Design an enzyme around this catalytic site. Sequence first.
Site, mmCIF file in Angstrom:
data_model
loop_
_atom_site.group_PDB
_atom_site.id
_atom_site.type_symbol
_atom_site.label_atom_id
_atom_site.label_comp_id
_atom_site.label_asym_id
_atom_site.label_seq_id
_atom_site.Cartn_x
_atom_site.Cartn_y
_atom_site.Cartn_z
ATOM 1 N N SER A 12 0.849 -1.217 0.000
ATOM 2 C CA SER A 12 0.000 0.000 0.000
ATOM 3 C C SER A 12 0.878 1.259 0.000
ATOM 4 C CB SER A 12 -0.832 -0.028 1.255
ATOM 5 O OG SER A 12 -1.555 1.179 1.434
HETATM 6 C C1 LIG Z 1 -2.357 -4.217 -2.512
HETATM 7 C C2 LIG Z 1 -2.812 -2.852 -2.991
HETATM 8 C C3 LIG Z 1 -2.846 -1.793 -1.902
HETATM 9 C C4 LIG Z 1 -4.066 -0.934 -2.199
HETATM 10 C C5 LIG Z 1 -3.698 0.327 -2.971
HETATM 11 C C6 LIG Z 1 -4.457 1.566 -2.455
HETATM 12 S S1 LIG Z 1 -3.944 2.024 -0.820
HETATM 13 C C7 LIG Z 1 -5.059 1.187 0.253
HETATM 14 C C8 LIG Z 1 -6.362 2.001 0.367
HETATM 15 N N1 LIG Z 1 -5.968 3.200 1.122
HETATM 16 C C9 LIG Z 1 -6.578 4.392 0.972
HETATM 17 O O1 LIG Z 1 -7.489 4.579 0.174
HETATM 18 C C10 LIG Z 1 -6.073 5.486 1.865
HETATM 19 C C11 LIG Z 1 -6.329 6.928 1.362
HETATM 20 C C12 LIG Z 1 -6.058 8.010 2.424
HETATM 21 N N2 LIG Z 1 -5.944 9.332 1.798
HETATM 22 C C13 LIG Z 1 -4.753 7.819 3.153
HETATM 23 O O2 LIG Z 1 -3.790 8.431 2.632
HETATM 24 O O3 LIG Z 1 -4.656 7.071 4.169
HETATM 25 C C14 LIG Z 1 -7.376 1.128 1.074
HETATM 26 O O4 LIG Z 1 -7.181 0.863 2.250
HETATM 27 N N3 LIG Z 1 -8.467 0.636 0.439
HETATM 28 C C15 LIG Z 1 -9.496 -0.196 1.045
HETATM 29 C C16 LIG Z 1 -10.876 0.497 0.928
HETATM 30 O O5 LIG Z 1 -10.942 1.695 0.620
HETATM 31 O O6 LIG Z 1 -11.951 -0.152 1.133
#
Ligand SMILES: CCCCCCSC[C@H](NC(=O)CC[C@H]([NH3+])C(=O)O)C(=O)NCC(=O)O
Lengths: 219, 220
Positions: A12
């Site tokens: 992540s």
């Molecule tokens: C293996 C790939 C890793 C995933 C890539 C995207 S990062 C993980 C994603 N995180 C976010 O959306 C965080 C955004 C927030 N602005 C922050 O910076 O903490 C999540 O938890 N998403 C779960 C959800 O939103 O339900």
Amino acid sequence: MSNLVLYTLHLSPPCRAVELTAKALGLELEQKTINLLTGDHLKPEFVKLNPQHTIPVLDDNGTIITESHAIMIYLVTKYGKDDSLYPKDPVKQARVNSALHFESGVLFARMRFIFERILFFGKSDIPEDRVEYVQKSYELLEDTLVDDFVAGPTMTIADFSCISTISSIMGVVPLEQSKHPRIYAWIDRLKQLPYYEEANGGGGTDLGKFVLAKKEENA
Amino acid sequence: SNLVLYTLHLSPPCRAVELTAKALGLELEQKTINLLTGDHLKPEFVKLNPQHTIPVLDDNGTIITESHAIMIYLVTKYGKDDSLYPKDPVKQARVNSALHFESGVLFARMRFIFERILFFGKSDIPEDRVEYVQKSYELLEDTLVDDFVAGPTMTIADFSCISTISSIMGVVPLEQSKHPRIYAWIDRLKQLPYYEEANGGGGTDLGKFVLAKKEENAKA
Ligand SMILES: CCCCCCSC[C@H](NC(=O)CC[C@H]([NH3+])C(=O)O)C(=O)NCC(=O)O
Ligand SMILES: CCCCCCSC[C@H](NC(=O)CC[C@H]([NH3+])C(=O)O)C(=O)NCC(=O)O
């Protein structure tokens, strides 16, 4: 007191920004894996920590902090010995704050608009418009890098947000070196850090690789 | 001397700033950047902000870009107390978390919907775009455990959220029966005596204008 806890996953990007921040602060983080791929973020103990059900989430001895940019600000404010990673001057802090929102509203958002439909919704393409949205974001980052770092002549937490995202998306939507000499030079700077590969470099590479892999697997 | 805002009243992040200025008792001198005629793409504007977005604040020569940075700056410089943006690290972390939820979720998904219509001649709102948006509503609704987005007190994270939500609910329906917390939070905000002038009319009008552009683009 107790070691800081990060609910987290090395793949992540916002988790890696926090891990670079920790290393910079010489803080040790206790990692508890939240595996998004086996749905751990939707399991019901985690939902009580974070109703938006995203990672990273910080547990500081019972104080819960959600959201990577809030987490990094919290850590510097509370655990920084100076404010080099997060300026206390209202004007230089505004330059950092504007760069953090650029990262969340533009760089990360556009990356997510590309990755999520593949990792989570089972799609096997990257549409023409998504490519153009991302490549436009690279160009905005290039134009912003008038200085050595993203928010001025000095490295800040806004560099950590930015590189955690760029190092992931670069290997899917190519960032061509000659259209982007400022980003390239900037990556080089951050690679000089002793902890860079370990806290971000490789997890970024691997996330890009994983999206292409899961995309052939979806087609 | 005058604080200047490079601004367009239809723009949600401009209205978030307008709300903040009213909450602090500040008077802004507003300078129109007409995005519809590419004012933001002109070399004179790009000099102010290499990302060429509005709002940009000019504080007596000091240039501050990006709505969330501007609201913080303004409360930091001009606030008589810290209620709109706390000093306490924990309380402040809860606001900072809502601000990045507004930029990274509410605004980015609204723009993923609007931009293609207003600038690229698109007549549709793809299905997935509608789904992103609906999902943003559900996340906001789950976040509103307290009366305001970052706790029992109204903060600058409320101004940022409502400026956007007031614009997109005109286009992607925010169902009342499924979002009673958002509806109650809206009613709290509309109590502010400067709500209509600072935000309500612009939010409604941006909704209308998107709906009118979309129909226009579907003809020709
Ligand atoms: C293996 C790939 C890793 C995933 C890539 C995207 S990062 C993980 C994603 N995180 C976010 O959306 C965080 C955004 C927030 N602005 C922050 O910076 O903490 C999540 O938890 N998403 C779960 C959800 O939103 O339900
Ligand atoms: C008719 C009114 C419709 C405008 C709705 C979108 S708001 C204006 C848009 N602003 C932004 O993207 C800024 C968001 C930024 N994070 C902030 O809050 O300052 C812009 O300047 N965009 C210009 C660009 O990126 O080129």
